[PDB]
Design a protein around this ligand. Structure first.
Ligand SMILES: CC(C)=CCC/C(C)=C/CC/C(C)=C\CO[C@H](COP(=O)(O)O)C(=O)O
Ligand SMILES: CC(C)=CCC/C(C)=C/CC/C(C)=C\CO[C@H](COP(=O)(O)O)C(=O)O
Ligand SMILES: [Mg+2]
Lengths: 252, 253
């Protein structure tokens, strides 16, 4: 089993053409609605389905059957993205194709910078046979704009864009440590397109670049893809009754 | 549960013990009876720990479990293992060791030796050894100085540039933000520059332990490195000879 080495999911993300990726928050979206949504993602040509949230409780009992219901509705890989908790590490369930593991390089708490990875692997394989574990996508995760919620929870400080000094240090780490992916996120604002370009030009060719946060239009998706993002994530735009119209606009 | 990667007793002792020399016994070259004779002397000098370390090893578990047990019966000092990892296995480990020094070779061109060795080692934990009997892990930034094709060929290391502080400062930023426990500055064929030691001491947090080793053969060298800010000054080869008692007395005095 690849585990922390590159596997099937990373290969699919590297070779698929760039595009939008819908993110289903499984603790806010009822499983029946997630299944209806998942059936549409497949038709649009998205590369994967991400299940992600800042908050979670009773993870294993909720997520194992939630992941199975989504997998029955779409052939796309199902990737989990959640923060770790001291004493447990990152949450995991069998059936997920991959876990996106964020190393929060801008956090003031070394647990969220990377020690969460050590706690997670110490606990591996735990309850799940090694042969059935999801693959791990080792990711540099950076936050942009004022965000006291993630700051309070994970210790993140917004990345300073007054110079490229801080991002240049993250680029050196992303390259030398052989991270698989970089995830640029803004909870309350927008990751700057020029930061996306700086990362695309500074990363190796096989390092996958995700951008998300407040993407609500196809124009925003296009601008980020033109700036070099491999995938543009969006969750909140579809957390409403008229999600089918919003999805068609974002994917158009 | 074992502290494992969290700070434990061995790190607390390294943090609080008086700075000084630390002898490193290569267990694949030094016979165990000589290691035991050495261990008794290191105890008298009040060194902080006994390191068992080597670039090379074979049949690790069967050789090291009895070797560590004999050294532990000879000294009350913590026994710390320091060896390179191997893809497919991670770092080598035996029960009985108090701690394993885990080197993140930040200057390597191979990401396995930069840090993925840590992921393979923890994945494999607990493995063949019960959780409660595992050694503590000392998370360490490991940096090499001077021409060294042996470590370059084995682990992908490139000598750290001392032409400016650009490279070193990036390693300090990582050492601090990632919360490494220790920094180990090593030169196989030359000497780590005392000024680099001082730059690291000034740049590290107060609880980050700084080790320097490589070609230390005299007490004057130990004093110079301790005066430059090293917490511990390692030495192996100086004692790999018949007149080791004289050499130890000169390095420790
Ligand atoms: C901070 C970090 C990057 C990782 C640590 C783990 C962590 C907190 C993972 C949860 C997923 C996440 C980064 C943000 C939540 O929502 C956005 C979509 O936003 P929108 O509703 O605005 O589209 C998403 O899932 O990407
Ligand atoms: C490259 C690195 C720092 C870590 C990777 C793992 C690794 C190769 C561990 C083995 C220990 C080591 C760094 C060097 C061997 O001898 C010196 C003492 O030298 P002297 O005989 O000149 O006194 C020592 O043990 O420190
Ligand atoms: Mg494990």
């Amino acid at each position: 089993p690849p585990l922390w080495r590159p596997g099937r999911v990373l290969a699919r993300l590297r070779e698929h053409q760039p595009g939008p990726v819908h993110i289903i928050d499984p603790f806010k979206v009822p499983v029946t609605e997630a299944v209806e949504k998942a059936a549409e993602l497949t038709r649009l040509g998205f590369a994967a389905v991400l299940l992600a949230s800042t908050d979670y409780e009773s993870f294993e009992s909720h997520m194992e059957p939630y992941v199975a219901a989504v997998k029955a509705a779409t052939p796309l890989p199902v990737v989990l993205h959640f923060p770790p908790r001291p004493g447990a590490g990152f949450p995991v369930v069998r059936g997920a194709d991959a876990l996106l593991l964020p190393a929060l390089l801008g956090s003031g708490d070394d647990y969220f910078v990377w020690k969460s990875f050590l706690e997670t692997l110490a606990a591996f394989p735990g309850r799940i046979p090694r042969e059935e574990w999801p693959e791990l996508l080792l990711t540099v995760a950076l936050t942009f704009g004022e965000d006291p919620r993630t700051g309070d929870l994970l210790g993140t400080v917004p990345v300073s864009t007054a110079s490229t000094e801080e991002i240049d240090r993250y680029l050196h780490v992303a390259r030398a440590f052989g991270f698989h992916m970089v995830y640029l996120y803004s909870r309350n604002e927008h990751v700057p397109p020029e930061v996306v370009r700086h990362f695309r030009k500074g990363l190796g060719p096989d390092q996958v670049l995700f951008v998300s946060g407040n993407v609500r239009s196809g124009r925003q998706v296009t601008e980020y893809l033109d700036s070099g993002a491999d995938y543009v994530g969006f969750a909140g735009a579809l957390e409403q009754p008229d999600w089918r119209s919003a999805l068609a606009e974002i994917a158009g």
